């Protein structure tokens, strides 16, 4: 004659009514939680693992005489954006190929995911190991982040292919092995842009980046971005050239000047500075 659903209800601890009926349903979760625990599929076991490896120990290699050379695991900082370039392997970009998004992070504590490799891109006349301006080179990811070698790459403008937030040409961390890997440094001072060709590059000096297949500068702007690793800004390639025009047409015919030496100022937001480790 026992009645159920008797208005106000207690917790299942008391056996006032319907206690056993709710208990088993309450008890079942762990049992179901047990089997889902039997196979590695819990999210909590998923979220943390990403931080561990990504936050795995990283040691930036030393710099001798400020002469950064291919092989020394170096960081890439944004001088104006006061952040270090960070990579992600989990999140997947909307790309049929296997390329992965990138994020610039304010934290400067050294982590593997923020380390790359500068391996010689192409055999050249410069067999001596000191990197020379305009000598082709490629961004290489640390072997610890991903099993397959990963290369940062960018493609051209496209109404279909465009930056998610910046709306400019996106920078892609993919496994392609074509033209899309090359890069070449260029001195910050606009006037010196010409007579720096072939000159040594010194660690600690500001560095700009431009794409040889497309000739666009890789820089960062004050735009928010969302991912698991907290909050972060975006990375993309573009030319923030000083909007002021220069009458280059009359320069040629009159011949006072040549196209090679640039007459258009390049603002700071493109400023990057290579930095080595604090100690050897």
């Amino acid at each position: 004659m026992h009645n159920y659903n008797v208005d106000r209800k207690y917790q299942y601890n008391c056996r006032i009514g319907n206690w056993s009926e709710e208990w088993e349903l309450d008890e079942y979760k762990m049992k179901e939680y047990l089997k889902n625990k039997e196979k590695q599929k819990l999210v909590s076991t998923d979220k943390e693992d990403r931080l561990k490896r990504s936050l795995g120990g990283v040691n930036l290699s030393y710099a001798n005489e400020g002469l950064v050379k291919f092989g020394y695991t170096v960081m890439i900082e944004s001088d104006f954006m006061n952040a270090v370039v960070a990579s992600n392997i989990w999140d997947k970009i909307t790309g049929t190929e296997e390329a992965y998004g990138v994020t610039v992070t304010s934290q400067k504590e050294p982590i593997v995911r923020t380390a790359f490799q500068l391996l010689r891109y192409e055999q050249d006349q410069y067999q001596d190991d000191v990197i020379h301006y305009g000598q082709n080179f490629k961004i290489a990811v640390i072997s610890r982040l991903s099993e397959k070698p990963l290369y940062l790459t960018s493609s051209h403008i496209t109404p279909q292919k465009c930056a998610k937030f910046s709306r400019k040409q996106e920078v892609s961390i993919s496994t392609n092995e074509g033209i899309n890997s090359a890069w070449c440094f260029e001195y910050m001072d606009p006037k010196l842009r010409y007579e720096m060709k072939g000159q040594p590059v010194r660690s600690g000096e500001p560095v700009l980046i431009k794409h040889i297949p497309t000739c666009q500068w890789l820089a960062t702007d004050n735009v928010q971005y969302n991912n698991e690793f907290g909050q972060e800004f975006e990375v993309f390639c573009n030319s923030y050239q000083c909007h002021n025009k220069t009458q280059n047409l009359i320069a040629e015919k009159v011949g006072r000047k040549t196209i090679e030496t640039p007459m258009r100022n390049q603002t700071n937001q493109n400023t990057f500075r290579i930095v080595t480790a604090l100690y050897p």
Binding site: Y4, N5, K9, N18, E21, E22, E24, L25, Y28, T96
Partner: protein, 430 residues
């Protein structure tokens, strides 16, 4: 290969759909990322029935969402397995239905249905040989009944060749939720009897009542009510997706579930529904199955299944089993119900054999039947309609959007005749 389509709209219509796909994926084995991770061999030979094929990265569920306001849609996207639906099929208006049928079918729907008609036809022509249409909508809802039915109305004109089912949720008098439930539903029922091929209704009151009685769950949530149906509705097409001994398609149901042309209203119940009480204490055997399947409190309708006579009933048996019981079980049940089974049309029960079992169960029974009691719901709504119409209550804002009382007069006569026509056969004797 003779696939059906899905067009879900309205606050009620979309909510039901959200559960069904999840149920379909689980049975058919497709993860949230849209990639297939099934086990059995036979589950990769028919995914076309309820899933398309696209670039190697996923299978696109052929879905369309229709509704007059954005809020209701915004929830479905954030729900689990919300990455499945392609954005292109996303259509949504900025005005809101407001539970006004006229606003849902005459003024606003006209300049939004053009695109939805555009998308549906595009999806419609994609198939090789379309098998039918199955629209989930709520007659008592402002956005659904008006906007939802019109989509149905156009479909009938343009494709008189395919068949159509209807899972509609009607309001029952005991549980009242919208003050305009009587009217807006009434205008709705008019356009289905002349246009709909198969109609099986679902009542909110039962779905609650089955839970606390059979399941006996203290505080079930919407997921439970929605979750049950999604599996149940997919039980209709079981023979239509995988191999089976006695293949049976809906059209077979249509021919074998409709006594007279205007008698295509259905109510359903599912078995075996077992509460967490004695799962391991009970044996699921055919004798237990047939016993529960005729339970008056297991069906998804509020009408009493013992106040009339059974015309036609069919269940697509699930799992491997021997025919003898099935023939013996019904024949055992059928003769023992001499008072509740019509006679001039003998052998009023069908059976089917599709071997594939739903996950976690060995015996599964899905039930459909045309029962004379259904009109009992019609009396309650209609009786409400006459009382609330005589004083022109709320009518003036069902007339101020461009429709006059004439059709109201036309419709109300429709139900009374429809109820009467379905009662005369109750006393019909050869």
């Amino acid at each position: 290969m003779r696939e059906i389509v899905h067009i879900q709209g309205g606050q009620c219509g979309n909510q039901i759909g959200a559960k069904f796909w999840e149920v379909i994926s689980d049975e058919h084995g497709i993860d949230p990322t849209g990639t297939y991770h099934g086990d059995s061999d036979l589950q990769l030979e028919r995914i076309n029935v309820y899933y398309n094929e696209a670039t190697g990265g996923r299978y696109v569920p052929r879905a369309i969402l229709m509704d007059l306001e954005p809020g209701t849609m915004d929830s479905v996207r954030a729900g689990p397995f919300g990455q499945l639906f392609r954005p292109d099929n996303f259509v949504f208006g900025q005005t809101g239905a407001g539970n006004n049928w006229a606003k849902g079918h005459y003024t606003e729907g006209a300049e939004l249905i053009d695109s939805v008609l555009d998308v549906v036809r595009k999806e419609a022509e994609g198939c090789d040989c379309l098998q039918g249409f199955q629209i989930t909508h709520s007659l008592g809802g402002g956005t659904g009944s008006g906007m939802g039915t019109l989509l149905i109305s156009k479909v009938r004109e343009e494709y008189p060749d395919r068949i159509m089912e209807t899972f509609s949720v009607v309001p029952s008098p005991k549980v009242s939720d919208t003050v305009v439930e009587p009217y807006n539903a009434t205008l709705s029922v008019h356009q289905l009897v002349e246009n709909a091929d198969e109609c099986m209704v679902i009542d909110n009151e039962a779905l609650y009542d089955i839970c606390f009685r059979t399941l006996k769950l203290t505080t079930p949530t919407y997921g439970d009510l929605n979750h049950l149906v999604s599996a149940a509705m997919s039980g209709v097409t079981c023979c239509l997706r995988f191999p089976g001994q006695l293949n049976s398609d809906l059209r077979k149901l249509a021919v074998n579930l409709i006594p007279f042309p205007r008698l295509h209203f259905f109510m359903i119940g599912f078995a075996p529904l077992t509460s967490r009480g004695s799962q391991q204490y009970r044996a699921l055997t055919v004798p237990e199955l047939t016993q529960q399947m005729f339970d008056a409190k297991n069906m998804m309708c509020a009408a009493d299944p013992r106040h009339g006579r059974y015309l036609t009933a069919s269940a697509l048996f699930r799992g491997r089993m021997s025919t003898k019981e099935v023939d013996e079980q019904m024949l055992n049940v059928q003769n023992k119900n001499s008072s509740y089974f019509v006679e001039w049309i003998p052998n009023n029960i069908k059976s089917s054999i599709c071997d594939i079992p739903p996950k976690g169960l060995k015996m599964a029974v899905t039930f459909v039947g045309n029962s004379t009691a259904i009109q009992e719901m019609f009396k309650r709504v209609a009786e409400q309609f006459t009382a609330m119409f005589r004083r022109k209550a709320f009518l003036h804002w069902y007339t101020g959007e461009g429709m006059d009382e004439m059709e109201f007069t036309e419709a109300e006569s429709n139900m009374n005749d429809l109820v009467s026509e379905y009662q005369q056969y109750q006393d019909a004797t050869a």
